[PDB]
């Protein structure tokens, strides 16, 4: 049914979202929210409409979601990064780039103001950067040529010049890690598998949109891709995905996330071991492994991908990937424990306040809707709405705190051709009905009205379900934001 959750099931926190896909995740922690930026995985089909394996043909945008609590995620839509080959309908930002794989994100205070930098790979040929004054844009290409190419000093022996990771150190110096691939083309020797020497680190200029000096090689044993950097107790941890070829020793298992430490961001690094098995080990099958380690609201986590949504829909992952987050633990000696990747994920860290404007596209669970960029007046940058709403569809938030006094009323911004209803229920999709909002015909799908209705019996902490009903097909209404009022 639908009606039913695809993969992220009520009470579980992984995958983070399941109303569309998101590969190669990276995290930015910024002023009480974590933002996750992702390659734009999107199904490819044979001409007869049957699913086929991901060939990365759709990897020309960056999807962005954010959360204050690890359970409810705001969908910020897509950044149209790639602008070459007519990509993104002429509205792509980096006109030189045909692709925008594997984003990295950084924030640095420049001239007294926080500036944001989004890095990406134009497939395996070069890394670019876009800039913005907020974590969600709007975005500018201040170069627009690649930032790093094989002609950048120190980058010549890189096989795949991709998968950037950008770190801003405590002294404000930025560093870019990148590269991967295995030399030897169709058939690497054992020694080429064991020491590809294709990983690189280069210092960035103060502006974060230039490099200084030359790149240094990081000799990551069995390097493949997926550079990562985090800093824990004054030590720099370079992490990466271990390759799949050649014989491997016990301590460098194929397709797992390995890590190295150094007292300096540019090395020398020493291999320490491995902390994330292949997603296939946990969720069945196998595929590429991509990750980022981050500290959010004082806890260490890893964001990574797995084929958990595509598998649920098609009965095979086919290379189509979804974001997951689990806790990461450093030991007293500075080594990292194996991450227990799972569906349960991270328990909600803070309650949601239902008395502020909350985007309709801020939800923890759904069955089964879509989000798209919204014609509603006002709203946040790249404001989205919930759409593809049919009778019996629903969305839900985790742990909204109505307080002891509870809610007086409920408001929703909606656009509808024929009208419908939003039932507000506590705890479950068939739970206590605290109100029902009648969505009128507004004049059309792009004509917006804020509607208010009474609620009663909404006190304390509950999951909240918004259950959609109406007659006729197809889309009952679009749904932009909501807000409760306090008793």
Ligand X SMILES: OCC1O[C@@H](O)[C@H](O)[C@@H](O)[C@@H]1O[C@@H]1O[C@H](CO)[C@@H](O[C@@H]2O[C@H](CO)[C@H](O[C@@H]3O[C@H](CO)[C@@H](O)[C@H](O)[C@H]3O)[C@H](O)[C@H]2O)[C@H](O)[C@H]1O
Select the binding partner of residue 480 from Ca ion, Na ion, ligand X, none (C-beta < 5 to 8 A, by kind): Ca ion
Residue 459, C-beta contacts closer than 8 angstroms, at least 6 positions apart = 402, 403, 404, 405, 406, 407
Stretch that binds Ca ion, among 40-48, 74-82, 180-188, 474-482 (CB under 5 A): 474-482
Q: 69: annotated binding-site residue?
A: no
> Is residue 320 within the footprint of ligand X (CB under 6 A)?
no
User: Following DSSP, what letter does each residue of 301-327 receive, concatenated?
Assistant: EEEEEESHHHHHHHSS-TT--EEEEEE
Q: 486: annotated binding-site residue?
A: no
CB 389, min distance to Na ion, A? 6
When the beta carbons of 362 and 390 are compared against Na ion, the nearer one is 390
> Is residue 98 within the footprint of ligand X (CB under 6 A)?
no
Residue 53, C-beta contacts closer than 8 angstroms, at least 6 positions apart = 44, 318, 319
Which of 24, 41, 69, 423 is an active site residue?
A: 24
Select the binding partner of residue 388 from Ca ion, Na ion, ligand X, none (C-beta < 5 to 8 A, by kind): Na ion
How many C-alpha atoms does 152 have within 13 Å on its Cβ side?
28
Select the binding partner of residue 183 from ligand X, Na ion, Ca ion, none (C-beta < 5 to 8 A, by kind): none
Of 383, 387, 390, 399, the one binding Ca ion (CB under 5 A) is: 383
> CA nearest 181: which of 202, 166, 201, 161?
161
User: Following DSSP, what letter does each residue of 276-309 receive, concatenated?
Assistant: E--HHHHHSS-----EEEEEETTEEEEEEEESHH
Helix and strand numbers (H, E) in the chain are 3, 32
CB 468, min distance to Ca ion, A? 16
Distances (CA, A) of 253 to 163, 225, 241, 275: 20, 14, 10, 10
Encode burial over 403-427: b for 16+ CB neighbours within 10 A, e otherwise: beebbebbbbbbbbbebbbbbbbbe
Select the binding partner of residue 288 from Na ion, Ca ion, ligand X, none (C-beta < 5 to 8 A, by kind): ligand X
Q: 248-254: long-range contacts (C-beta < 8 A, 24 or more apart)?
A: 248/222, 252/221, 252/222, 253/277, 254/222, 254/278
For the question of residue 225 being annotated catalytic, the response is: yes
> Is residue 160 within the footprint of ligand X (CB under 6 A)?
yes
CB 312, min distance to ligand X, A? 18
Of 30, 96, 232, 244, the one binding ligand X (CB under 6 A) is: 244
Which of 75, 141, 163, 225 is an active site residue?
A: 225
Q: 288: annotated binding-site residue?
A: yes
Select the binding partner of residue 390 from Na ion, Ca ion, ligand X, none (C-beta < 5 to 8 A, by kind): Na ion
* Contact residues: ligand X, CB under 6 A: 56, 123-124, 160, 162, 225, 244, 255, 280, 285-288
Binding-site residue set for substrate: 288
Binding-site residue set: 288, 359, 361, 383-384, 480
Please list the active-site residues.
Answer: 24, 225
């Amino acid at each position: 049914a639908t009606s039913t959750t695809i993969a992220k099931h009520i009470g579980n926190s992984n995958p983070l979202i399941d109303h569309h896909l998101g590969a190669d995740p990276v995290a930015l922690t910024y002023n009480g929210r974590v933002y996750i930026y992702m390659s734009s995985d999107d199904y490819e089909y044979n001409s007869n409409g049957t699913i086929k394996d991901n060939s990365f043909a759709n990897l020309n945008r960056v999807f962005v979601i954010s959360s204050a609590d690890m359970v409810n995620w705001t969908d910020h839509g897509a950044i149209p990064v790639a602008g070459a080959n007519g990509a993104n309908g002429g509205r792509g930002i980096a006109k030189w780039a045909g692709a925008s794989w594997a984003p990295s994100i950084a924030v640095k205070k420049i001239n007294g103001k926080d500036k944001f930098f989004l890095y990406f790979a134009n497939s395996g040929g070069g890394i670019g950067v876009l800039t913005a004054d907020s974590p969600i844009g709007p975005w500018t290409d201040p170069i627009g040529k690649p930032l790093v190419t094989p002609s950048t000093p120190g980058m010549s022996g890189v096989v795949w010049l991709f998968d950037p990771a950008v770190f801003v150190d405590d002294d404000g110096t930025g560093y870019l890690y990148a590269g991967g691939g295995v030399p030897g083309v169709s058939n690497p020797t054992q020694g080429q598998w064991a020491n590809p020497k294709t990983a690189r680190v280069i210092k960035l200029g103060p502006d974060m949109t230039s490099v200084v000096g030359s790149a240094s090689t990081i000799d990551a044993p069995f390097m493949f891709e997926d550079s990562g950097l985090h800093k824990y107790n004054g030590t720099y941890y370079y992490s990466y995905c271990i390759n799949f070829g050649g014989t491997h020793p016990a301590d460098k298992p194929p397709g797992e996330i390995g890590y190295m430490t150094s007292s300096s961001p540019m090395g020398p690094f020493t291999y320490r071991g491995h902390f994330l098995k292949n997603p296939g080990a946990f969720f069945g099958g196998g595929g590429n492994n991509h990750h980022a380690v981050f500290n959010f609201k004082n806890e260490w986590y890893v964001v990574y991908h797995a084929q958990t949504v595509s598998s649920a829909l098609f009965g095979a992952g086919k290379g189509y990937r979804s974001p997951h987050i689990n806790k990461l633990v450093h030991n007293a000696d500075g080594s990292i424990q194996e991450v227990a990747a799972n569906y349960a994920g991270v328990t909600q860290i803070s309650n949601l306040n239902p008395y502020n404007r909350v985007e309709a596209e801020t939800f923890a669970w759904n069955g089964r809707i879509l989000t798209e960029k919204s014609t509603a007046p006002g709203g946040p940058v790249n404001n989205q709405h919930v759409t593809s709403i049919q009778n019996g569809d629903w969305i839900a938030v985790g742990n909204a705190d109505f307080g002891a006094g509870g809610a007086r009323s409920f408001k929703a911004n909606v656009a509808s051709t024929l009208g419908g209803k939003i039932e507000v229920r506590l705890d479950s999709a068939d739970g206590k009905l605290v109100g029902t909002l009648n969505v009128p015909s507004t004049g059309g799908a792009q004509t917006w009205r804020e509607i208010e209705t009474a609620v009663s019996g909404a006190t304390g902490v509950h999951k909240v379900f918004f259950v959609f009903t109406g007659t006729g097909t197809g889309n009952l209404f679009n749904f932009d934001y909501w807000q409760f009022t306090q008793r």
